[PDB]
């Protein structure tokens, strides 16, 4: 729709977008001295569903990953656009894309998709991680397209209490991969039933690149640790 400015100078459409995102799935990201961890909770409605069939994290390339909060099909089509855009960057450039560049590309894409008329703007928020030139990178993108840099953040359901908890935690000097246990704690603070083998997804990007965790070590980190 051709949404325009209110008499208050506020776009009610993007406010509705962020409100719909805030009711979405809780998720957390943390940037440690050896990489970036992304984590999310998927509560399957029944035992009938297959957890391995559909994932919440998708590798754009060997070293870039993005989790989300909000709409599902919107997220998967945005995964398609992000993968394709990073790919033509590699086509023109013949080097892997740095994180921040594809960040403003997808932020731009959000800007036209909330600018062009006829189309309803997107109702998802995205969290991006990568390892570029040794320095890790983690950013957040809103539906309106304003991209922010965060070393630790929480987006989704009850995200403000998670933000306060990672304010108390996360001294940002954890050179090891202990921040993944902190992310497990942050999710367990809002976990509904139990921390199980499949409900929690965790993804890591280290110097070796971005690698989706096998649920075996997910059950391992669920065990003993918390």
């Amino acid at each position: 729709s051709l949404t325009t400015f209110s008499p208050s100078g506020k776009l009610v459409q993007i406010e509705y977008a962020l409100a719909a995102v805030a009711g979405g799935a809780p998720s957390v990201g943390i940037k440690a001295a050896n990489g970036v961890v992304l984590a999310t909770e998927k509560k399957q409605k029944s035992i009938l569903y297959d957890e391995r069939s559909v994932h919440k994290v998708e590798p754009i390339t060997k070293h870039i990953g993005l989790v989300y909060s909000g709409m599902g099909p919107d997220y998967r089509v945005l995964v398609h656009r992000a993968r394709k855009l990073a790919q033509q960057y590699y086509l023109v450039y013949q080097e892997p894309i740095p994180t921040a560049q594809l960040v403003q590309r997808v932020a731009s894409v959000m800007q036209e998709y909330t600018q062009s008329g006829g189309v309803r703007p997107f109702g998802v928020s995205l969290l991006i991680c990568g390892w570029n030139e040794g320095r890790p990178y983690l950013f957040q993108s809103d539906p309106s397209g304003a991209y922010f840099a965060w070393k630790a953040t929480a987006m989704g359901k009850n995200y403000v209490n998670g933000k306060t908890f990672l304010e108390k935690r996360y001294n940002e000097d954890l050179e090891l991969e202990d921040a993944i246990h902190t992310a497990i704690l942050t999710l367990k603070e809002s976990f509904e039933g139990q921390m199980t083998e499949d409900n929690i997804e965790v993804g890591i990007c280290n110097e070796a690149g971005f690698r989706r965790l096998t649920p075996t070590e997910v059950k391992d980190y669920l065990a003993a640790i918390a």
Partner: protein, 238 residues
């Protein structure tokens, strides 16, 4: 201008038209259920004929989307056939531009994206049918997938779609709690008894449609009336 008529976000972003489409699917008083066995998958759908004047062979909700994949619909009939033809088109396009039998998930993903771009813009009805695919994939076995008009999908060990949705899911869950290597005739017996106890009708053999795809016969096939009544009298005493 409020979004109760056109696809725009709301206070708390409630897109009313998609639940409206879900109710439109539930308007058609029919139900289907899909059950995946150890090496088989079965779709059991009930049908109703108002009179004998209509040709009962013409009414069919099961469709051979490819030689190895079967699909079944619920909603208004014309939109159902339309998206059947679109999935047929995309399957044939994939086969032509790639050269192999498309996996079930790729068809599911592509038409999910089609539903997403339907519901993304205005001036386009966001469609009113739900979809079930059954198939076999190499080194994967049988696969059963479901799509909505909203573009959502998942993987299911077994599921159902229709008006009497919830009790079907509860019965299926309490049956799969003691799963223990479902076998072919046992799968179709359990599916038939599930549909029967959901509808409480004790249907005669000529009211049902059954479609089974198997590792032993990777070509998707349609069950005839003879084996239907054979399975019914097999499940008659039990």
């Amino acid at each position: 201008g409020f979004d109760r008529h056109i696809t725009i976000f709301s206070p708390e972003g409630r897109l009313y038209q998609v639940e409206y489409a879900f109710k439109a699917i539930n308007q058609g008083g029919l139900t289907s259920v899909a059950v995946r066995g150890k090496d088989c998958a079965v779709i059991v759908t009930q049908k109703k004929v108002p009179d004998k004047l209509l040709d009962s062979s013409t009414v069919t909700h099961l469709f051979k989307i490819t030689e190895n994949i079967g699909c079944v619909m619920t909603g208004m009939t014309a939109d159902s056939r339309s998206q059947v033809q679109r999935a047929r088109y995309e399957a044939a396009n994939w086969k032509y531009k790639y050269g192999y039998e498309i996996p079930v998930d790729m068809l599911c993903k592509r038409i999910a994206d089609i539903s997403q771009v339907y519901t993304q813009n205005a001036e386009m009805r966001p469609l009113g049918c739900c979809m079930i695919l059954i198939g076999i994939d190499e080194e994967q076995g049988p696969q059963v997938y479901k799509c909505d008009p909203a573009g959502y999908y998942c993987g299911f060990k077994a599921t159902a779609a229709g008006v009497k949705q919830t009790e079907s899911t509860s019965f299926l869950e309490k049956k799969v709690k003691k799963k223990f290597d479902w076998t072919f005739e046992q799968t179709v017996e359990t599916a038939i008894t599930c549909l029967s106890t959901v509808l409480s009708i004790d249907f005669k053999p000529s009211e049902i449609e059954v479609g089974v795809v198997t590792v032993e016969n990777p070509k998707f096939r349609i069950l005839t009336e003879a084996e239907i009544d054979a399975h019914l009298v097999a499940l008659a005493e039990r």
